């Protein structure tokens, strides 16, 4: 067969030959509480598809970034929202010619 | 390697005498008074450093504490003793000489 006498190639066992192994994967079904599994299977039902999750991402992200520009960058008190709060570098156009 | 077809689970040959004897062979000699310590010992000063640093428990030791020196030397010798003890035990048990 495969595992004995150093016969490392068998046509009837191509998984052991090629190396298609699960080094750490176990197939046990008893992990999570069924109340918790029900909760988190139901909480993801509306997004368990590709296009629907991409729709949620698009909606939530467009909304988050738009409201970031509208209120969030102000609530974060970003300097770009406050403005210069001074005259600025207006009159110092150059060391020689102090342009506006 | 015609042998070793399963990666044995006892890859380290554990004899519980080894850690005990390494702790004993390093720490008991680590409690011998030398005049460089002022009549005290490395391990005694180490336990004293841990006692002083346990007083202000949340904050950690300083940089000029002299606790780190004792810790690092004690653990250097300790890890070397335990390592060589495991090596010697599994060299006497196995071949290698």
């Amino acid at each position: 067969k495969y595992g004995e006498n150093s016969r490392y190639f068998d046509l009837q066992d191509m998984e052991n030959t090629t190396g298609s192994w699960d080094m750490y994967g176990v197939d046990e079904k008893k992990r999570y509480p069924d109340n918790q599994a029900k909760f988190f299977t139901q909480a993801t039902d509306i997004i368990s598809r590709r296009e629907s999750l991409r729709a949620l991402v698009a909606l939530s992200g467009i909304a988050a970034i738009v409201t970031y520009g509208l209120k969030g960058a102000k609530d974060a008190d970003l300097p770009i929202t406050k403005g210069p709060q001074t005259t600025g570098e207006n009159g110092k156009g150059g060391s020689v010619r102090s342009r506006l | 390697e015609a042998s070793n077809k399963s990666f044995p689970r006892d890859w380290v040959k554990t004899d519980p005498l080894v850690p005990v004897l390494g702790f004993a062979g390093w720490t008991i000699p680590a409690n011998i008074g030398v005049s460089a310590f002022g009549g005290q010992s490395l391990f005694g000063l180490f336990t004293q450093s841990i006692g002083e640093n346990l007083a202000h428990f949340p904050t950690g030791p300083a940089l000029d504490d002299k606790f780190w020196l004792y810790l690092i030397t004690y653990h250097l010798g300790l890890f070397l003793t335990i390592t060589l003890g495991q090596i010697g035990v599994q060299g006497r048990k196995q071949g290698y000489w």
Binding site: - | E1, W11, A36, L63, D64, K66, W68, L69, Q90, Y96, W97
Partner: protein, 741 residues
């Protein structure tokens, strides 16, 4: 008996017959040239002795005599430096005033206006201010006269002629057999007892009898003309017993083991001499006595002809683990069979040693008035750092050459080398990941600081003020070595260096050495150092482990060590060879050590070097390294643009040649890019369109003009790149530090 002299009488006849026939050493080039590539191959294969023949005996003889020639050349160079310090120097003037007079030992002839290079160095002299530190070395030897330099030069020329006679002898007249070279036990026993043990013992004797009294009197203000000559300190014991009363006891305290009586000239002072700014010569004398004893007992370790001792084969063969298979078996055969395996290890450790030297010569300046010659100190760090990096790259090279040529898989079955080649993918993958991790977390820190300070957010930088990454481990080690004489080295009067902390030693107003603080900038640059080192290691080690085979090319060993590519196939296989990995490791060695020496220069000019005139240490750049070197714009502005003011304004002054070699080095570096960016096939067609014009005018040569090889193009490019970059840095460094330091 086993270990003995074994030579052949008159193996090779001494004649110029093979001088008239170039390419004689190979079977391919001895037929003569037809293309110009022959002219390059004649030089590339000149010292490739292991391809001229297969027998290790003839290769070994060639190597031995070649080493003799290198030694003779080194002796010529040493004698030349001593001679230039004897005839063309201000040494006797510098000894009287070493804090004011600039060390110079190269006079320029006044031919085309280069008499401007004969600068006003001091002592009524006009020449080029040297930075090799020979004056400090000679003062530390106790020279005090140009005649002694003259006779040392003549002795060096005698010894050079002796070395060349020795090479001729040991090749042509009496050349040793292979079983003589293969006595590595004897070679190590002798190179440890007699070469490094007896050499250090003899140098200790000189340091006891010549350097210590002469320098003790030099430090006591005595004029070098009225100091007793060394032979007078040998014969007249009264002078020495006046200087050190333990010389009144003779050599009895040694044979009675009352060694503490010798505590006048064998000390453990530590720190620096306050009057010279260098290490105590009594400390160095005791040092060399000690390591001489140590090496002389280390040279009695291996077994040669009397059963006592060790067999290196037995140490190696009995060192094996459960993780490592058979262990070091077959390595004795590897290293007693391959010259390249030896050369790899030797170059690696020799270059790491040269960098050890660079780091240990500035923190512990061994020579009087070395630390206060900031040019000599900077040059001596930079030079040995560069030599070390080059040697390390060559170590990777010759490891690869071993793996290609001298590797035999029959000798190496499940030994350590086989087990490395078997999991080279793990090795190189983890090395790649750490190189990426370090590149990010070491350079993106600099980019983060650039972005923050450019955006006007200095509170978000990685600095000693905003987000501190303090190097707490190195700081703890500094404090552990500063407090060492109090607890962990009670017989030391001071620490080894003042860089650990404490008081500064300032000599002549200039700071010889002072504590070195480390902060966030030092953290970042040290991690940059480790990053670049790890990438160079990645390249060279990947060239070593994949020198025989890879998942791309499984037959790379048959292709060779030095080949350009297998083809454009497999998507493209250029620079798959183990030679091209060295070619790239050269670039990364340059990139690493440029930053190393930049870190050195800036840290020294900002936080160590300076003057104390009033109450206060005024450094050269004012300590900007702490706050300015968080950014790449910092190294631009305050190092590469600020410290370039001395090299680009050097025109019309004594340092103008430094500016010239600045510009010319910028030329050569960029010229390298003609060879690195391009490829042979363009130049061959350009060359043949030129050969058409030569044929038309009947001036086409018989030796057909070819473009350089691909490998040769890469070699020329890396050579010009390294030369130009290193010489640009050399000019910049020296022009800066001769002026401001």
């Amino acid at each position: 008996k086993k270990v003995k002299i074994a030579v052949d009488r008159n193996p090779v006849e001494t004649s110029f017959e093979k001088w008239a026939k170039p390419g004689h050493f190979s079977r391919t080039l001895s037929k003569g040239p037809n293309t110009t590539t022959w002219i390059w191959n004649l030089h590339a294969d000149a010292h490739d002795f292991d391809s001229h023949t297969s027998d290790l005996e003839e290769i070994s003889r060639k190597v031995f005599s070649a080493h003799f020639g290198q030694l003779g050349i080194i002796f010529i160079w040493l004698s030349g430096m001593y001679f230039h310090g004897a005839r063309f120097s201000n040494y006797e003037a510098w000894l009287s005033d070493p804090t004011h007079i600039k060390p110079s030992a190269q006079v320029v002839w006044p031919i085309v206006g280069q008499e401007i290079l004969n600068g006003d160095v001091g002592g009524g002299f006009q020449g080029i201010q040297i930075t090799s530190g020979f004056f400090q070395l000679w003062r530390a030897s106790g020279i005090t006269s140009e005649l002694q330099l003259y006779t040392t030069a003549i002795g060096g020329l005698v010894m050079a002629a002796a070395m060349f006679f020795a090479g001729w002898f040991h090749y042509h007249k009496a050349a040793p057999k292979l079983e003589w070279f293969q006595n590595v036990e004897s070679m190590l026993n002798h190179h440890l007892g007699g070469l490094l043990g007896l050499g250090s013992l003899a140098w200790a004797g000189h340091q006891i009898h010549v350097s210590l009294p002469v320098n003790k009197l030099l430090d006591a203000g005595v004029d070098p003309k009225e100091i007793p000559l060394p032979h007078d300190l040998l014969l007249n014991r009264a002078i020495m017993a006046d200087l050190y009363p333990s010389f009144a006891k003779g050599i009895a305290p040694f044979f009675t083991l009352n060694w503490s009586e010798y505590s006048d000239f064998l000390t453990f002072k530590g720190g620096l001499n306050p009057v010279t700014g260098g290490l105590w010569l009594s400390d160095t004398a005791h040092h060399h006595v000690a390591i001489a004893v140590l090496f002389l007992v280390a040279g009695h370790m291996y077994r040669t002809n009397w059963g006592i001792g060790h067999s290196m084969k037995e140490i190696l063969e009995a060192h094996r683990g459960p993780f490592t298979g058979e262990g070091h078996v077959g390595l004795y055969e590897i290293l007693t069979t391959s010259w390249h395996a030896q050369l790899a290890i030797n170059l690696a450790l020799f270059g790491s040693l040269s960098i050890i030297v660079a780091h240990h010569m500035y923190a512990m300046p061994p020579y009087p008035y070395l630390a206060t010659d900031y040019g000599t100190q900077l040059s001596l760090f930079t030079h040995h750092t560069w030599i070390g990096g080059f040697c390390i790259v060559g170590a990777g090279a010759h490891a690869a050459i071993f793996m290609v040529r001298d590797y035999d898989p029959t000798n190496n079955y499940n030994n350590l080398l086989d087990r490395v080649i078997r999991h080279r993918d793990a090795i190189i993958s983890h090395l790649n990941w750490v190189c990426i991790f370090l590149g990010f977390h070491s350079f993106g820190l600099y980019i983060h600081n650039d972005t923050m300070s450019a955006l006007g957010r200095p509170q978000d930088m990685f600095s000693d003020t905003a987000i501190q990454l303090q190097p707490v481990f190195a700081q703890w080690i500094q404090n552990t070595h500063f407090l060492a004489p109090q607890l962990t080295a009670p017989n030391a009067l001071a620490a080894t260096s003042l860089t650990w902390g404490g008081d500064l030693v300032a000599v002549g107003g200039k700071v010889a050495m002072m504590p070195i603080s480390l902060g966030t900038s030092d953290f970042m640059v040290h991690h940059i150092h480790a990053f670049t080192i790890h990438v160079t290691v990645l390249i060279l080690l990947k060239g070593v482990l994949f020198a025989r085979s890879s998942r791309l090319i499984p037959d790379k060993a048959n292709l060779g060590f030095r080949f350009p590519c297998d083809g454009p196939g497999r998507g493209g296989t250029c620079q798959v060879s183990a030679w091209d990995h060295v070619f790239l490791g050269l670039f990364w060695m340059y990139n690493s050590l440029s930053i190393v020496i930049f870190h050195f220069s800036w840290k020294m000019q900002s936080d160590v070097w300076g003057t104390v005139t009033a109450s206060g240490v005024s450094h050269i750049t004012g300590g900007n390294f702490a706050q300015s070197a968080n950014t790449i714009n910092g190294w631009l502005r305050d190092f590469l643009w600020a410290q370039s003011s001395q090299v680009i304004q050097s025109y019309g002054s004594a340092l103008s040649a430094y500016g010239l070699i600045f510009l010319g080095a910028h030329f050569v570096w960029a010229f390298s890019l003609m060879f690195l960016f391009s490829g042979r096939g363009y130049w061959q067609e350009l060359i043949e369109s030129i050969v058409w014009a030569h044929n038309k005018l009947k001036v086409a040569p018989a030796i057909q003009p070819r473009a350089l090889s691909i490998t040769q193009g890469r070699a020329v490019g890396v050579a010009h790149y390294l030369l130009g970059g290193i010489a640009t840095t050399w000019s910049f460094f020296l022009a800066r530090i001769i002026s401001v330091g």
